[PDB]
Amino acid sequence: EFANYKRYATENAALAQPVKKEKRVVFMGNSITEGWVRTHPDFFKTNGYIGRGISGQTSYQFLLRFREDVINLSPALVVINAGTNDVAENTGAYNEDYTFGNIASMAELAKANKIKVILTSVLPAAEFPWRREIKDAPQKIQSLNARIEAYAKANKIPFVNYYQPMVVGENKALNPQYTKDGVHPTGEGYDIMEALIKQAIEKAL
Amino acid sequence: EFANYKRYATENAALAQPVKKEKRVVFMGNSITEGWVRTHPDFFKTNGYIGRGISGQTSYQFLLRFREDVINLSPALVVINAGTNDVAENTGAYNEDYTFGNIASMAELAKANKIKVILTSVLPAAEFPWRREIKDAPQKIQSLNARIEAYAKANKIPFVNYYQPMVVGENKALNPQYTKDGVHPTGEGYDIMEALIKQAIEKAL
C-alpha cells in the first residue's frame, strides 16, 4: 500500500522484456518526474525513456518499490531524483542519514543488477506550499545534494546538477523563470532539465 | 516510524567501528530472531553475534531499516531470516514476488557493501495464532523457501535450512518438540537452529 506498487503494476506487466540494443532507461522520482512525463510526453517517447515517478513520494517509498519499478524492468540505466518530499516530511521527520541512505541503497541495488546509475540534485525549493511550517528547506536540500554528489564522485557515478542552473537568490529559491509554485518546474524549467539529462544518458550509453 | 529505526538506533550508535579480525555477524529477522537473543543470550555473547530482530516485522520493514541495522554496522556477515510475518500479512496482502524480492534486495545490498550473506528458510507454521483466517501458510512458506534456496544456489550464497529438521506431518507444522505455540521456537527448538547457523557462519569465515 505505502510503496504504491499498484500505480505501475499493470504497465510493468504490459512492458515487453528488453534487448540490450534498446538501451532501456527508467526515471525514478516523485511529482517532479511524474509531472515531467505529463508535461512533455514527447521527450520520453522520442528518447525511449520510461517514467516511474509518483507524486508526493519520498526516498523510503522509492526504495520499497525499486525492485518492481526499476530492477524487474531490466533497464540499461536508471535516473534517480529523490529527496524533495523527504525534506517536506511527507512520510515522517526529516533525517538526512536515512534519506541519503535510501538513495545510496537504490544506487547499490541497480549496480548489483548491472544497471547504470545517474544520480541527480534535489531541485531548489525556498518552501513547500503543502507544508509551509518547514523554514529550513534550502539548508537541508543543499546539504543532501552535496552528500549525493560526494557519494557519486566516490563511486564514479555520473551526477546531474539540475539545482545549479535553476537556483536563485539568498533564499535559494527555484528560479521564477522555471516555476509558478516554487517547487514544480514549468515547461521552460523542464527544458533546462531535458538538455542536461539527455546529454548525461547519451554519454553513459 | 513503520521501519522502526528507533528500536536499535541507540545500540547501533553505541557500537564501536569493527576491525576485520572481529568477524562481526549481524542477524536480521523478526520475533524468531528477537526471541532467540532473549532466550539464549549466551549463544550470541559467546559467538560474537549481534541480534537485530524486531517482533512482528515483515521483509518490507527489514528492507527499509537494512542500511541502518546491517550495512552501517560494517559486519563481515549477515544472517537473514524473513517471511513469517509476510505470510501472516502483518503489513498487507501476501505477495511472494514482493516478499522474495525484498529478501533478494537485502542480499544484493549486503554483497554490494562487501558483506557475506547467509539466507535461511522461513520456519514451518501450520497457522499463525494472531491471524487464524490464513489457512494456506504451509503452501506459501514452502513456495517462498524453494524460491529463496534456488536464488541462493544461483548466486553461491549459503542457504541454511531450519525448516527441513523442524517440520512434521501433512499440515507441515513446526515440530511440537521445538515449539509451544506452533510459530515461536522453545529453547529446544533454538538448539537445532544454533547448531546449523554456528556451523554455516564458521564455514563462511
Domains of chain A: which residue ranges?
Answer: 1-205
Cell numbers placing B166: 523442524
DSSP state string for chain A: -TT-THHHHHHHHHSPPP-GGG--EEEEESHHHHHHHHH-HHHHHHHTEEEEE-TT--HHHHHHHHHHHTGGG--SEEEE---HHHHTTSSSS--HHHHHHHHHHHHHHHHHTT-EEEEEPPPP-S--TT-TT---HHHHHHHHHHHHHHHHHHTT--EE-SHHHHEETTTTEEPGGGBSSSSSB-HHHHHHHHHHHHHHHHHH-
Q: State the Rg of chain B over Cα.
A: 16
For chain A, the residues whose C-beta falls within 8 A of a C-beta of chain B are 1-3, 5, 60, 63-64, 66-68, 71-72, 92, 97-98, 101-102, 104-105, 108-109, 111-113
Residues B119 and B156 sit within 8 Å (Cβ to Cβ): no
The neighbouring-strand residues paired with B87 are none
CA distance B108 to chain A (A): 6
Contact residues for B23 (Cβ-Cβ < 8 A; gap 6+) = B48, B76, B77, B205
What single letter denotes the amino acid at residue A44? F
Closest CA to B18 of B79, B73, B77: B73
**Angle (nearest 5°) at CA A84 between A103 and A101:** 20
β-bridge pairing B25-29 and A173-174: unpaired
Closest CA to B97 of A115, A112, A114, A5: A5
The neighbouring-strand residues paired with B116 are B77
Write out chain A residues lying below 8 Å of B109, CB-based.
105, 108-109, 112
Cell numbers placing B127: 497457522
Tally of CA atoms within 13 A in the half-sphere of B117 that contains its CB: 28
**Phi and psi torsions of B130, nearest 5°:** -85, 0
Distances in Å between the Cα of B5 and the Cα atoms of A199, B12, B142 are 39, 10, 30
Q: Are residues A101 and B1, on separate chains, in Cβ contact within 8 Å?
A: no
Contact residues for A75 (Cβ-Cβ < 8 A; gap 6+) = A18, A24, A25, A26, A50, A115
Contact residues for B93 (Cβ-Cβ < 8 A; gap 6+) = none
Closest CA to A82 of A102, A59, A65: A59
Q: Which of B6, B109, B147 to mutate to test the interface with A (most CBs of A within 10 A)?
A: B109
**Angle (nearest 5°) at CA A78 between A76 and A84:** 175
Instruction: Assign B166 to helix, strand or coil.
Output: helix
Resolution in A: 1.8
Contact residues for A87 (Cβ-Cβ < 8 A; gap 6+) = A94, A99, A122, A125, A128, A134, A137, A140, A141, A144
Residue in B1, B2, B105 nearest the CB of A109: B105
What single letter denotes the amino acid at residue A34? E
Distances in Å between the Cα of B174 and the Cα atoms of A174, B55, B102, B108, B193 are 59, 18, 24, 30, 13
Cell numbers placing B176: 511440537
- E strand or H helix that includes residue B103: helix B96-112
Closest CA to B117 of B16, B44, B28: B28
**Phi and psi torsions of B70, nearest 5°:** -135, -70
How many CB pairs below 8 A link A and B?
Answer: 52
Write out chain A residues lying below 8 Å of B71, CB-based.
101, 105
Obtained via which technique?
X-ray
Distances in Å between the Cα of B107 and the Cα atoms of A94, A180, B102 are 27, 44, 9
How far, in Å, CA of B98 to CA of A156, rounded?
30
Report the side by side order of strands in the sheet with B25-29: B49-53, B25-29, B77-80, B116-120, B159-160
β-bridge pairing B116-120 and B159-160: parallel
Residue B71 has a CB neighbour count (10 Å cut-off) of 21
B176 DSSP 8-state letter: G
**Phi and psi torsions of B53, nearest 5°:** -80, 145
Q: Are residues A72 and B101, on separate chains, in Cβ contact within 8 Å?
A: yes
**Phi and psi torsions of A191, nearest 5°:** -60, -40
Residue B108 has a CB neighbour count (10 Å cut-off) of 21
Closest CA to A98 of B5, B62, B30, B111: B5
- With left for phi above 0 and alpha for psi between -120 and 50, is residue A158 left, alpha or beta? beta
Residue in A2, A67, A104 nearest the CB of B105: A67
How far, in Å, CA of A22 to CA of A24, rounded?
6
Residues B124 and B179 sit within 8 Å (Cβ to Cβ): no
Q: State the Rg of chain A over Cα.
A: 16
Closest CA to A30 of A98, A113, A96, A91: A91
CATH hierarchy code of domain A1-205:
3.40.50.1110
